[PDB]
Design an enzyme around this catalytic site. Structure first.
Site, mmCIF file in Angstrom:
data_model
loop_
_atom_site.group_PDB
_atom_site.id
_atom_site.type_symbol
_atom_site.label_atom_id
_atom_site.label_comp_id
_atom_site.label_asym_id
_atom_site.label_seq_id
_atom_site.Cartn_x
_atom_site.Cartn_y
_atom_site.Cartn_z
ATOM 1 N N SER A 6 27.349 14.834 -22.065
ATOM 2 C CA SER A 6 26.203 13.972 -21.784
ATOM 3 C C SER A 6 25.084 14.169 -22.812
ATOM 4 O O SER A 6 23.913 13.965 -22.504
ATOM 5 C CB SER A 6 25.683 14.167 -20.361
ATOM 6 O OG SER A 6 26.621 13.605 -19.473
ATOM 7 N N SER B 135 23.380 8.969 -17.147
ATOM 8 C CA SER B 135 24.212 9.312 -18.292
ATOM 9 C C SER B 135 25.586 8.659 -18.236
ATOM 10 O O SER B 135 26.330 8.760 -19.224
ATOM 11 C CB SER B 135 24.362 10.806 -18.440
ATOM 12 O OG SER B 135 23.155 11.450 -18.838
ATOM 13 N N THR C 252 30.094 11.545 -15.780
ATOM 14 C CA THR C 252 29.019 11.749 -14.832
ATOM 15 C C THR C 252 27.698 11.148 -15.289
ATOM 16 O O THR C 252 27.486 10.832 -16.461
ATOM 17 C CB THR C 252 28.813 13.246 -14.562
ATOM 18 O OG1 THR C 252 28.497 13.865 -15.805
ATOM 19 C CG2 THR C 252 30.030 13.926 -14.010
ATOM 20 N N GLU D 238 13.941 7.395 -21.274
ATOM 21 C CA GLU D 238 13.281 6.421 -20.417
ATOM 22 C C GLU D 238 14.233 5.748 -19.429
ATOM 23 O O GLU D 238 13.792 5.347 -18.345
ATOM 24 C CB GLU D 238 12.574 5.342 -21.244
ATOM 25 C CG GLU D 238 11.375 5.837 -22.007
ATOM 26 C CD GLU D 238 11.610 6.535 -23.337
ATOM 27 O OE1 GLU D 238 12.786 6.702 -23.787
ATOM 28 O OE2 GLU D 238 10.598 6.910 -23.962
ATOM 29 N N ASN E 190 22.186 13.858 -25.102
ATOM 30 C CA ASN E 190 21.224 12.764 -25.187
ATOM 31 C C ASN E 190 20.941 12.317 -26.617
ATOM 32 O O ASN E 190 20.845 11.125 -26.906
ATOM 33 C CB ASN E 190 19.914 13.109 -24.497
ATOM 34 C CG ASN E 190 19.967 12.896 -23.010
ATOM 35 O OD1 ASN E 190 20.577 11.921 -22.543
ATOM 36 N ND2 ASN E 190 19.264 13.712 -22.257
ATOM 37 N N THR F 44 23.281 11.994 -14.148
ATOM 38 C CA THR F 44 22.273 12.591 -13.280
ATOM 39 C C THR F 44 20.901 12.168 -13.776
ATOM 40 O O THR F 44 20.498 12.578 -14.839
ATOM 41 C CB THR F 44 22.384 14.115 -13.273
ATOM 42 O OG1 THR F 44 23.707 14.510 -12.948
ATOM 43 C CG2 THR F 44 21.479 14.724 -12.235
ATOM 44 N N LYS G 142 27.077 6.565 -21.048
ATOM 45 C CA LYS G 142 27.570 7.141 -22.294
ATOM 46 C C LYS G 142 29.073 7.021 -22.424
ATOM 47 O O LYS G 142 29.593 7.023 -23.546
ATOM 48 C CB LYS G 142 27.105 8.599 -22.420
ATOM 49 C CG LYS G 142 25.591 8.756 -22.490
ATOM 50 C CD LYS G 142 25.098 10.165 -22.251
ATOM 51 C CE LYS G 142 23.582 10.214 -22.181
ATOM 52 N NZ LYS G 142 23.010 11.455 -21.597
ATOM 53 N N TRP H 203 18.244 18.040 -23.357
ATOM 54 C CA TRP H 203 19.646 17.948 -22.979
ATOM 55 C C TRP H 203 20.477 17.333 -24.101
ATOM 56 O O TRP H 203 21.099 16.276 -23.956
ATOM 57 C CB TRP H 203 19.930 17.239 -21.631
ATOM 58 C CG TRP H 203 21.319 17.577 -21.154
ATOM 59 C CD1 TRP H 203 22.512 16.986 -21.498
ATOM 60 C CD2 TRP H 203 21.658 18.603 -20.201
ATOM 61 N NE1 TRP H 203 23.560 17.624 -20.888
ATOM 62 C CE2 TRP H 203 23.069 18.605 -20.059
ATOM 63 C CE3 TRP H 203 20.907 19.514 -19.450
ATOM 64 C CZ2 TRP H 203 23.734 19.473 -19.187
ATOM 65 C CZ3 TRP H 203 21.565 20.376 -18.597
ATOM 66 C CH2 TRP H 203 22.958 20.353 -18.467
HETATM 67 B B1 LIG Z 1 22.276 12.106 -17.883
HETATM 68 O O1 LIG Z 1 21.757 11.140 -16.917
HETATM 69 O O2 LIG Z 1 22.997 13.084 -16.997
HETATM 70 C C1 LIG Z 1 23.448 14.285 -17.641
HETATM 71 C C2 LIG Z 1 24.149 15.109 -16.633
HETATM 72 C C3 LIG Z 1 25.309 14.456 -16.122
HETATM 73 O O3 LIG Z 1 26.159 13.834 -16.882
HETATM 74 O O4 LIG Z 1 25.564 14.446 -14.840
HETATM 75 C C4 LIG Z 1 22.329 15.022 -18.300
HETATM 76 C C5 LIG Z 1 21.615 14.158 -19.326
HETATM 77 C C6 LIG Z 1 21.075 12.839 -18.699
HETATM 78 N N1 LIG Z 1 19.990 13.197 -17.795
HETATM 79 C C7 LIG Z 1 18.736 13.638 -18.132
HETATM 80 O O5 LIG Z 1 18.400 13.707 -19.327
HETATM 81 C C8 LIG Z 1 17.772 14.150 -17.024
HETATM 82 C C9 LIG Z 1 18.471 15.433 -16.456
HETATM 83 C C10 LIG Z 1 19.011 15.651 -15.157
HETATM 84 C C11 LIG Z 1 19.639 16.945 -14.964
HETATM 85 C C12 LIG Z 1 19.615 17.728 -16.116
HETATM 86 S S1 LIG Z 1 18.857 16.873 -17.359
#
Ligand SMILES: *[B@@]1([O])O[C]([C]C([O])=O)[C][C][C]1[N]C(=O)[C]C1=[C][C]=[C]S1
Length: 270
Positions: A107, A47, A212, A145, A109, A214, A50, A82
């Protein structure tokens, strides 16, 4: 060269305790001193792309003065897991600025995919990064993806160093016009997702903006930030992690710990 890693820090022990790889690049924008560990390796963006997405939107808004306040309606098919902000505005729409803030600060999506479409997709964001002199960044795919984080796959990656250099250009340098620069900084300062990462290493009385990421697999997570210690020049830094096994867990603590080591290596008292 001469100002890189003047003071060694135990990054190797930290990443071994984590069970993966940690990539760190931190720059003192006053002196030019740097801390660098695996800084030119590629890591998945997750993320964290972004933040750059929102900067690309702001750059476009320099040529399109009505862009940020443009209302965007979207269907339920636009929602992605998310999407904490855009799901609350499904029935109303949101402005481009609101989608950008949501992408940066939550974050979100769905917001990120809507804004990618505005820019001409992953190649359009990559083109913006090239335009500011970043030859490392690549975005290749959309949400979700782009989160696959496959070992050895360069898609949807950058390096800690390139992330830091681009962040500096956009937040402190001249890549954005002054109004847009301050809006980018304000969005980063209002981030909600980073309290356990670089911010956990930064005293509460210092200003900080961060973004961030994740991925959810391969121990892959990250954070980048601009930090304003009082009484000295700002610090820009990036901390990226990954791990060899798909089921490996990410660690926020490891990110905070690496950020503390970076500040110690720069001689920034915290
Ligand atoms: B993104 O890569 O990371 C977000 C969290 C962050 O900014 O640290 C959440 C949305 C995106 N990630 C995902 O869609 C997969 C997930 C991982 C943990 C919660 S959702």
């Amino acid at each position: 060269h001469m100002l890189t890693n003047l003071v060694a820090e135990p990054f190797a022990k930290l990443e071994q305790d984590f069970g993966g790889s940690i990539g760190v690049y931190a720059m003192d924008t006053g002196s030019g001193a740097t801390v660098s560990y695996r800084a030119e390796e590629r890591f998945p963006l997750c993320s964290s792309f972004k933040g750059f997405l929102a900067a690309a939107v702001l750059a476009r808004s320099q040529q399109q003065a009505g862009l940020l306040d443009t209302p965007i309606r979207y269907g339920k098919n636009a929602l992605v897991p998310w999407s904490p902000i855009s799901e609350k505005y499904l029935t109303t729409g949101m402005t481009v600025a609101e989608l950008s803030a949501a992408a940066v600060q939550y974050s979100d999506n769905a917001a990120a995919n809507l804004l990618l479409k505005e820019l001409g997709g992953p190649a359009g964001l990559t083109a913006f990064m090239r335009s500011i002199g970043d030859t490392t960044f690549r975005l290749d795919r959309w949400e979700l993806e782009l989160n696959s984080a496959i070992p050895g796959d360069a898609r949807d990656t950058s390096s800690p160093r390139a992330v830091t250099e681009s962040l500096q250009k956009l937040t402190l340098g001249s890549a954005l016009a002054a109004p847009q620069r301050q809006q980018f900084v304000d969005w980063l300062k209002g981030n909600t997702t980073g309290n356990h990462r670089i911010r956990a290493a930064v005293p509460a009385d210092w200003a900080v903006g961060d973004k961030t990421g994740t991925c959810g697999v391969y121990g892959t997570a990250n954070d980048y930030a601009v930090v304003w210690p009082t009484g000295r020049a700002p610090i820009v830094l990036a901390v990226y992690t990954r791990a060899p096994n798909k089921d490996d867990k990410h660690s926020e603590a490891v990110i905070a710990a690496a950020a503390r080591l970076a500040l110690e290596g720069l001689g920034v008292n915290g």
